[PDB]
Amino acid sequence: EDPAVDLLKNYMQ
């Protein structure tokens, strides 16, 4: 997990 990985899912959902 990285700040990116959290944001990817933040933009997806």
What CA–CA distance (Å, rounded) separates 6 from 11?
Answer: 9
3-state DSSP helix/strand/coil % of the chain, to nearest 5: 75, 0, 25
Backbone angles phi, psi at 11, to 5 degrees: -90, -30
- How many helices (H) and strands (E) the chain has is answered by 1, 0
E-only strand ranges, the chain: none
Tokens 């990116």 appear where? Answer: 4
Residue type, 11: Y
* 3, 4, 7 from 12: Cα distances, Å: 14, 12, 8
- Structure letter (DSSP) for residue 1: -
Tokens 């944001």 appear where? Answer: 7
Per-residue H/E/C for 1-13? CCHHHHHHHHHHC
